[PDB]
Design a protein around this ligand. Structure first.
Ligand SMILES: Cc1cc2nc3c(=O)[nH]c(=O)nc-3n(C[C@H](O)[C@H](O)[C@H](O)COP(=O)(O)OP(=O)(O)OC[C@H]3O[C@@H](n4cnc5c(N)ncnc54)[C@H](O)[C@@H]3O)c2cc1C
Ligand SMILES: [Cl-]
Length: 488
């Protein structure tokens, strides 16, 4: 008989899951498995992203229970768990979504060898990304395109991505009963308190495939907005109803299939001939994800500066004081501090909000390495993606892809163009709630009487600005100009 395991790592969903469809085919028993490291926090990860994963697994558990099955959260490392459960469950086939991250390739290689020793067939379909990323490289002459414009001409020569896979059957072959490694008390989904966290999650975005689909349909309720979407024209100060889809955490964990997203976009585009085109369109945003995935998977040391063949080597400063002030939202610039407060509270900010804080920390003001800001983003972001977080930090620091280091966002003027009353600022920084809008972006310019009437004295309730933007930015520009000249 055929007994199979569908191993969840990403792809935390039942829709468009070719690995699950293959695991169920002609199977007598199916073991849906997620491997959890109970010593993860005793190693970096916020409760917001880890609870988002737990809610995603809880959503999987209900979906499996609704089809006569059950999700098994096995404790331990995969190289030690699978050799046992291969023999105990009589497994003949192992199925999991292909992953191109560096750690994934080492882990998957090791598991593949253990599977061959136990006589277990391994099927690893591609469905995290739109395309087979190795096929795009092979189609482009053996090297990944380094520009979005050339990357778009490649995907247009390849054609549409594969259709989303059909849904699994209404009933699924259940796990075998009374197997010791499948005991319910040792395979349940843990809560955020049980994995070690002490502070509760504060984010407003709930995890799981069900939430991902409901947010997808909400984005498509207005097909004209989808068709006319232009990323650079969206509002970073909008928080009550964010100006973009906020599908990034679900695409990161695979709660939403990118191919389903892409297939829905094409339906709307066929009916609205004036729809926006890449790179600004909503399809263009999925292409940025694919573009960065294709470059980064074929570039060694992509997440670092040294040894990265595509990253500029810049003499970033080792200023721990500037980094701590930026990390703890006490720079003295309310627009910067409000975004960094949203980072720790929600785990998600609008793309241009991330532009503001990343330019400020790196090539704009503090001249700290993009790797340091990256480490802070990887801790709190619920959409934390190894390749996207890398490439966008190298973009914002003018270390890769982007080179116009003379374009420097003002931490005073940028948000003021969207939100002159500072509603975004008062939301996330309630200490400035009573500050009049004339000084909300520049509280140190307010007279002492106004600061006292609003109960926010600069240097007592809210910190004074750590740098003068006009002085700091001119220095960063002069130094970036020399870094782009000394190289060749
Ligand atoms: C410094 C910095 C760090 C970032 N780190 C991450 C990260 O860790 N994870 C992440 O998902 N995105 C990251 N981004 C990209 C961008 O911030 C988010 O993808 C976007 O803000 C998510 O909101 P959304 O889903 O509403 O985007 P939408 O505008 O709705 O775009 C839809 C989808 O397209 C993809 N996408 C959009 N913009 C980009 C982009 N610039 N690069 C790659 N994919 C994109 C995402 O999968 C997103 O869900 C980063 C950008 C910056 C400037
Ligand atoms: Cl500006």
């Amino acid at each position: 008989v055929k007994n199979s395991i569908i191993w969840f790592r990403k792809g935390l969903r039942l829709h468009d899951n070719p690995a699950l469809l293959e695991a169920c085919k002609d199977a007598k028993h199916v073991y849906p498995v997620f491997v959890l490291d109970p010593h993860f926090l005793q190693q970096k990860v916020s409760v917001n992203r880890y609870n988002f994963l737990l809610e995603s697994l809880e959503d999987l558990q209900r979906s499996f229970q609704a089809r006569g099955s059950r999700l098994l959260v096995l404790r331990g490392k995969p190289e030690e768990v699978f050799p046992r459960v291969f023999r105990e469950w009589g497994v003949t086939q192992l199925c999991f979504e292909h992953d191109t991250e560096p750690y994934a390739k080492v882990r998957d290689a090791a598991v593949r060898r253990l599977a061959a020793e136990a006589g277990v067939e391994v099927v690893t379909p591609i469905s995290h990304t739109l395309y087979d990323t190795d096929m795009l490289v092979a189609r482009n002459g053996g090297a990944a395109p380094l520009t979005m414009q050339s990357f778009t001409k490649l995907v247009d020569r390849v054609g549409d991505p594969p259709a989303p896979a059909p849904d699994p059957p209404a009933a699924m072959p259940p796990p075998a009963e009374d197997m010791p490694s499948a005991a319910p008390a040792a395979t349940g989904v843990p809560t955020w308190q049980e994995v070690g966290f002490k502070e509760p999650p504060l984010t407003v975005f709930k995890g799981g495939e069900t939430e991902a689909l409901a947010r997808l349909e909400a984005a498509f309720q207005d097909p004209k907005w989808v068709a006319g979407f232009q990323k650079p024209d969206t509002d970073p100060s909008a928080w009550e109803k964010p100006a973009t889809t906020v599908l990034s955490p679900y695409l990161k964990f695979g709660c939403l299939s990118a191919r389903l997203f892409h297939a829905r976009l094409l339906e709307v585009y066929r009916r609205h001939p004036a729809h926006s085109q890449p790179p600004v369109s909503l399809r263009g945003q999925l292409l940025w994800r694919e573009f960065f995935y294709t470059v980064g998977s074929t570039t060694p040391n992509f997440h670092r500066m040294a040894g990265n063949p595509v990253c500029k080597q810049i003499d970033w400063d080792d200023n721990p004081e500037f980094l701590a002030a930026w990390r703890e939202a006490r720079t003295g610039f309310p627009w910067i501090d409000a975004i960094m407060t949203q980072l720790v509270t929600w785990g998600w900010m609008h793309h241009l909000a991330r532009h503001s804080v990343a330019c400020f920390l790196t090539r704009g003001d503090l001249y700290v390495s993009w790797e340091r800001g990256m480490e802070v983003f990887e801790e709190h972001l619920i959409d934390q993606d190894h390749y996207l977080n890398a490439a966008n930090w190298m973009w914002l620091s003018a270390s890769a892809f982007f080179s116009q280091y003379f374009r420097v966002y003002s931490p005073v003027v940028f948000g003021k163009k969207y939100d002159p009353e500072g509603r975004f600022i008062r939301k996330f920084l309630p200490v400035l709630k009573d500050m009049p809008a004339k000084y909300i972006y520049e509280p140190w310019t307010a007279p002492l009487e106004v600061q006292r009437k609003a109960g926010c004295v600069v240097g007592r309730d809210y910190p004074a600005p750590i740098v003068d933007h006009a002085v700091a930015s001119k220095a960063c520009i002069a130094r970036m100009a020399a870094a782009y000249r000394r190289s060749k």
